[PDB]
Amino acid sequence: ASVERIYQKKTQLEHILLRPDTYIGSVELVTQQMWVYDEDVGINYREVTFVPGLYKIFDEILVNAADNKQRDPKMSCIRVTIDPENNLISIWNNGKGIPVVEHKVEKMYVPALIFGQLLTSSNYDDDEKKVTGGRNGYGAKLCNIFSTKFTVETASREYKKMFKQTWMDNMGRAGEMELKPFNGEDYTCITFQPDLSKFKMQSLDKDIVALMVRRAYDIAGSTKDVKVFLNGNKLPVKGFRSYVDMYLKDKLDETGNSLKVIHEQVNHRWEVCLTMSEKGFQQISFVNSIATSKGGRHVDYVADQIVTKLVDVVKKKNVKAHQVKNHMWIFVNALIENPTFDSQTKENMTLQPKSFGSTCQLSEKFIKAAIGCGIVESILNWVKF
Amino acid sequence: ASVERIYQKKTQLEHILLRPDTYIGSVELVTQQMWVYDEDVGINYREVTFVPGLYKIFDEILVNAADNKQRDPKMSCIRVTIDPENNLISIWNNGKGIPVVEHKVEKMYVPALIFGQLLTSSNYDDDEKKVTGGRNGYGAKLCNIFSTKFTVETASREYKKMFKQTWMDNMGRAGEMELKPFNGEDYTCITFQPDLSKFKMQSLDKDIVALMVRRAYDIAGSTKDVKVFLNGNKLPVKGFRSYVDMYLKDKLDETGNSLKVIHEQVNHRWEVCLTMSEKGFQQISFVNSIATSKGGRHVDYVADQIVTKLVDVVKKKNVKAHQVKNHMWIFVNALIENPTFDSQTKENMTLQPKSFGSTCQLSEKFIKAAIGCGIVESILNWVKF
Ligand SMILES: Nc1ncnc2c1ncn2[C@@H]1O[C@H](COP(=O)(O)OP(=O)(O)NP(=O)(O)O)[C@@H](O)[C@H]1O
Numbered sequence: 091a092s093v094e095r096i097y098q099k100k101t102q103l104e105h106i107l108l109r110p111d112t113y114i115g116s117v118e119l120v121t122q123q124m125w126v127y128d129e130d131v132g133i134n135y136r137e138v139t140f141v142p143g144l145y146k147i148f149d150e151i152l153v154n155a156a157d158n159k160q161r162d163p164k165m166s167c168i169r170v171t172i173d174p175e176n177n178l179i180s181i182w183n184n185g186k187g188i189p190v191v192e193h194k195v196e197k198m199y200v201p202a203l204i205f206g207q208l209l210t211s212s213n214y215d216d217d218e219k220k221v222t223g224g225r226n227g228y229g230a231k232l233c234n235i236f237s238t239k240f241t242v243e244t245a246s247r248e249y250k251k252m253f254k255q256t257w258m259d260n261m262g263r264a265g266e267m268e269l270k271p272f273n274g275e276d277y278t279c280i281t282f283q284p285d286l287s288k289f290k291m292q293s294l295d296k297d298i299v300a301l302m303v304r305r306a307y308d309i310a311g312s313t314k315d316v317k318v319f320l321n322g323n324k325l326p327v328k329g330f331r332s333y334v335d336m337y338l339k340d341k342l343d344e345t346g347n348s349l350k351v352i353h354e355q356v357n358h359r360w361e362v363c364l365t366m367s368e369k370g371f372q373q374i375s376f377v378n379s380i381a382t383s384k385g386g387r388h389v390d391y392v393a394d395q396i397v398t399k400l401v402d403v404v405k406k407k408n409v410k411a412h413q414v415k416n417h418m419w420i421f422v423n424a425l426i427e428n429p430t431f432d433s434q435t436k437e438n439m440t441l442q443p444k445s446f447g448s449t450c451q452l453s454e455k456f457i458k459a460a461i462g463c464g465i466v467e468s469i470l471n472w473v474k475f
Numbered sequence: 476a477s478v479e480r481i482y483q484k485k486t487q488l489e490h491i492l493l494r495p496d497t498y499i500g501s502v503e504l505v506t507q508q509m510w511v512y513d514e515d516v517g518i519n520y521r522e523v524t525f526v527p528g529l530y531k532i533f534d535e536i537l538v539n540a541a542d543n544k545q546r547d548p549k550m551s552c553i554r555v556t557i558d559p560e561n562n563l564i565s566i567w568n569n570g571k572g573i574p575v576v577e578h579k580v581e582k583m584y585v586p587a588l589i590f591g592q593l594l595t596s597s598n599y600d601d602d603e604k605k606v607t608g609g610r611n612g613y614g615a616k617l618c619n620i621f622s623t624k625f626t627v628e629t630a631s632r633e634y635k636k637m638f639k640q641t642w643m644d645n646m647g648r649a650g651e652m653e654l655k656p657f658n659g660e661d662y663t664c665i666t667f668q669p670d671l672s673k674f675k676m677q678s679l680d681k682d683i684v685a686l687m688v689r690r691a692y693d694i695a696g697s698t699k700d701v702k703v704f705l706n707g708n709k710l711p712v713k714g715f716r717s718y719v720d721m722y723l724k725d726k727l728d729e730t731g732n733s734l735k736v737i738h739e740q741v742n743h744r745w746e747v748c749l750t751m752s753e754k755g756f757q758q759i760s761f762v763n764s765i766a767t768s769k770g771g772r773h774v775d776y777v778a779d780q781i782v783t784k785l786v787d788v789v790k791k792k793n794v795k796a797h798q799v800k801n802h803m804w805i806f807v808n809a810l811i812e813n814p815t816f817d818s819q820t821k822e823n824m825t826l827q828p829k830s831f832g833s834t835c836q837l838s839e840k841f842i843k844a845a846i847g848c849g850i851v852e853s854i855l856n857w858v859k860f
């Protein structure tokens with residue numbers, strides 16, 4: 091047992107491949123109940139088996155595409171294609187492309203820099219209060235590292251050029267940089283082959299495809315003025331309200347009545363829905379289109395208002411906060427300035443509300459409509475005993 | 476508005492100081508209810524205001540000290556000093572010190588290598604199934620980076636030497652290395668002054684000191700055959716059960732009765748306690764002496780057995796799992812082989828039970844003592860309504 095074998099130093103790439111968990115999530119198979127979109131039945135809540143890391147390297151490129159809408163408000167469309175046979179995933183989007191020019195500081199072209207070098211980002215200047223999802227300068231490079239082949243193509247009409255380059259073998263080598271004269275509609279397309287040996291999978295199977303499809307529906311439902319192609323098929327989502335309705339299409343509660351939905355778009359950065367939950371406290375939230383599956387201070391900031399109001403109400407007619415919360419199923423779509431998270435996977439948004447860059451005070455009509463639901467009634471019937 | 480201002484690349488240290496959240500947690504103030512050890516109140520649950528990152532850089536060194544017990548069973552003592560007036564924290568441990576010799580590969584001495592270079596660890600060979608908390612090779616360098624002064628002292632009798640060296644200015648520079656002849660009992664002492672400017676703090680105030688002291692009590696409760704000193708005073712903790720008694724002593728439920736405590740040390744790697752909860756589902760768990768404050772699959776693995784058995788018991792009489800779970804307050808102390816987590820802060824342990832390296836099937840005696848709790852009675856009083 092020599093010292094040189096015991097104590098080792100790893101490069102950034104070696105550490106990412108050796109310890110992928112804090113970067114992309116688990117690289118082992120997980121079986122858990124998730125919301126998916128199947129070909130025949132659409133949105134459904136079913137138990138799925140999948141590798142979180144593969145799903146996450148898909149989510150990174152998708153959220154980058156969504157952030158380009160914040161970068162260029164004239165962007166209108168995303169196009170996602172998933173071909174399991176050839177193991178090929180493409181994410182394309184319109185709007186301003188990446189500047190095709192040499193970086194005077196790092197001495198390489200900008201797409202090569204921000205797709206083949208770790209810790210590269212346009213979000214490192216926090217004096218700019220951005221509502222994009224990207225924060226750390228990892229996601230695209232992480233998807234590159236966990237792919238066998240990874241091609242980036244982007245066209246800039248301002249620079250009148252088009253860039254295309256390919257990385258291979260877990261970002262261990264790069265192909266030929268192809269530059270061509272360009273003068274048409276700006277676009278960005280990322281096409282990658284997931285390294286299924288890193289995830290111990292044979293091919294892109296059904297569960298992972300359904301999860302990716304539901305993620306495309308999420309992007310269609312959380313962004314503004316964006317249509318989403320999926321294998322050339324548009325996603326019929328017109329607003330966060332219709333997206334939320336996709337989850338509760340005439341689904342009844344345990345007594346037989348249709349679930350009552352209380353909805354309000356508070357402002358240009360917050361849209362909230364609330365309904366009854368049988369499975370305890372549920373939340374489906376988005377921060378800058380990022381699916382925050384663990385929630386965060388935005389969800390707390392929205393839900394604690396309802397909780398305090400209902401607690402005061404039930405105190406009038408005579409209680410714990412968690413009892414009120416466990417009957418709530420809340421949907422939040424929020425745009426937060428320079429959000430912080432627990433990890434690269436960004437499942438828990440930890441930014442304090444004072445730094446949100448916006449507010450989300452619920453209207454008195456929304457609050458009164460929340461009083462009308464059977465939450466207060468059930469809790470008041472509880473407190474009697 | 477130029478390209479080189481927009482698209483930027485950061486070094487590892489630069490990125491850590493610029494984006495500390497995924498490395499150490501938030502560097503902003505947090506106000507939330509925590510368990511702390513207040514002088515003359517002992518352990519108590521109260522609101523505290525603190526910076527998570529400061530707490531975490533303390534926790535990293537404390538956990539490393541605990542890990543040395545797994546490295547060397549002959550180790551017997553950890554000594555913690557907190558001097559708020561001089562902004563000094565010192566963590567000393569006995570057992571085998573770090574080898575004081577030049578690392579032939581990295582061409583420098585081993586302590587300097589593993590405390591002044593990022594991505595350096597003895598835990599990178601997962602063919603070795605270890606139950607240490609160290610996994611990534613960051614923690615000690617993270618404490619170094621967020622300290623104005625960070626001194627490592629370690630003695631190796633095997634190499635007949637003693638190493639001492641100090642880094643300053645956020646691991647920006649290092650002082651002179653001291654190598655002295657040594658032929659005594661090995662030890663390792665880490666002494667640092669946290670860079671409180673990075674945390675917008677002026678001194679180690681009451682709340683952060685109480686949190687650090689409660690963490691020392693955590694270590695005294697979660698480790699085996701290790702004495703824990705705090706400022707030279709012995710912590711009167713004799714096992715996980717007495718540690719839990721520090722939480723559940725003289726506690727009463729809202730009706731006026733004492734709480735039923737169901738305890739079992741399943742094996743040398745698992746110890747569990749269970750009681751009632753008036754605040755919803757509560758858990759206090761440790762993995763390899765790391766406080767997993769968000770829980771994880773070890774907590775789920777222990778709690779789902781209780782939940783399913785109580786569910787069967789309630790189904791016998793003429794209920795959902797979360798309803799049973801919300802009445803539970805569980806304590807879990809576990810040793811997990813090569814655990815994985817969502818982030819460097821290791822608050823959520825994500826390793827699947829099948830990879831734990833050990834099992835924890837609760838005894839029929841424990842299950843029967845659990846069905847006799849007020850959980851089943853409260854659930855059936857709810858069903859009667
Ligand atoms: N579809 C896209 N359209 C335009 N710019 C893009 C697109 N995808 C990526 N980029 C740019 O490429 C950069 C690198 O992306 P990425 O590696 O994901 O880092 P990031 O998004 O800034 N932060 P993070 O995702 O948290 O690591 C981004 O910051 C964007 O400036």
Ligand SMILES: Nc1ncnc2c1ncn2[C@@H]1O[C@H](COP(=O)(O)OP(=O)(O)NP(=O)(O)O)[C@@H](O)[C@H]1O
Pocket residue numbers: 535539540543568571572573589590595596597598608609610611612613614615616663
């Ligand atoms: N008190 C100690 N006694 C002996 N060896 C130690 C001690 N503290 C640290 N080390 C060694 O120094 C290495 C660096 O520690 P650290 O940077 O915390 O990484 P790590 O503990 O291995 N993994 P992590 O803490 O999760 O980032 C450890 O892996 C140990 O081999």
Ligand SMILES: CCCc1cc(=O)oc2c(C(=O)N3CCCc4ccccc43)c(OC)cc(OC)c12
Pocket residue numbers: 123124125126142145305308373374375376381382383384385437
């Ligand atoms: C491990 C992958 C993380 C994850 C990723 C994802 O994309 O979705 C998730 C959903 C999930 O399907 N939804 C619907 C869309 C977005 C969303 C936002 C917040 C909460 C849940 C959901 C989910 O529902 C139990 C649970 C999840 O993690 C346990 C994940």
Ligand SMILES: CCCc1cc(=O)oc2c(C(=O)N3CCCc4ccccc43)c(OC)cc(OC)c12
Pocket residue numbers: 500508509510511527530690693758759760761766767768769770822
């Ligand atoms: C960012 C700090 C993370 C954190 C760190 C810590 O050390 O403790 C915590 C406790 C806490 O006091 N305890 C008691 C001992 C250890 C423990 C283990 C698991 C769960 C809770 C606890 C806690 O109690 C709600 C809540 C916590 O975070 C929300 C934290």
Ligand SMILES: [Cl-]
Pocket residue numbers: 431432433434435436437438439
């Ligand atoms: Cl997160």
Ligand SMILES: [Cl-]
Pocket residue numbers: 816817818819820821822823824
């Ligand atoms: Cl974590």
Ligand SMILES: [Mg+2]
Pocket residue numbers: 150153154223224225228229230
């Ligand atoms: Mg990104």
Ligand SMILES: [Mg+2]
Pocket residue numbers: 535538539608609610613614615
């Ligand atoms: Mg460590």
